[PDB]
Structure formats: C-alpha cells, structure tokens
C-alpha cells in the first residue's frame, strides 16, 4: 500500500497534496475515484493525489 | 462548488462554454466524466468536462 510519485505535482486545491517526484505515500482512501486520499511519508501531510502520477513501491 | 481551470468551448448544444476562473454548482455527476453543472456567472446550465475543473 505504498506508492511513489513519478512526477512533480502542484496542488490545484487546498485538499490536494503537492509533491515532488520520488515522494512516497501511504494511501488512505482509493474508493472515491482516480484522486486518492494519501499521506506523504516525507511531511505527514494528508490530501488528494492523482493516481496516474504514481506507481506502487 | 467547482472552479474552471481552463477555457472550454462547447462541442454540442447541451455542453456549457466557460472561461477560466468561472465557478459552478454541480447538479448531476452520476452519469460519467461529463457533469451537468450550473454556471454561477451566467446561470446557464449544461455539461462540463470534470477534468477541466477543481473544487473551490
């Protein structure tokens, strides 16, 4: 249940996560669509991420 | 409520055209990736592409 970012992403909304390529995530919720709720393992920040920007670790 | 991230020119009559920055009330999002929305700038209703918008 760990994913890594393949690209940088700048948040488009407050509930989004911003992140850099290589950042790792714990996925908290993937049942609502292609945007997943995640926890950054670098900052502890939680928010939504686009699931085509990541790959499983 | 959602905001448009890009301009969009309607490709069909039932589509909504809009400018970047425009805000919408979503009326129906259960039919797919095109959502029925109400423009809060014009009051016009129509379908919009849900990858052209972000929550406000």
């Amino acid at each position: 249940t760990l994913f890594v970012a393949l690209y940088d992403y700048e948040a488009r909304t407050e509930d989004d996560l911003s992140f850099h390529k290589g950042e790792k995530f714990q996925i908290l919720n993937s049942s609502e669509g292609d945007w997943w709720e995640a926890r950054s393992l670098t900052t502890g920040e939680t928010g939504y991420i686009p699931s085509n920007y990541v790959a499983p670790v | 409520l959602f905001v448009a991230l890009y301009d969009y020119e309607a490709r069909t009559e039932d589509d909504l055209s809009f400018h970047k920055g425009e805000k919408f009330q979503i009326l129906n999002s259960s039919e797919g990736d095109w959502w029925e929305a109400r423009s809060l700038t014009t009051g016009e209703t129509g379908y919009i592409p849900s990858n052209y918008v972000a929550p406000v």
């Binding site: 669509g33 945007w35 686009p50 085509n52 | 999002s29 990736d33 918008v53 972000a54 929550p55």
Partner: peptide, 10 residues
Amino acid sequence: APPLPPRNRP
C-alpha cells in the same frame, strides 16, 4: 507532466 484525471464525484 501528464494530464490530470477527472475529479472525483462530489
């Protein structure tokens, strides 16, 4: 940077 996916349904 690839295109973003459609937002989740409200």
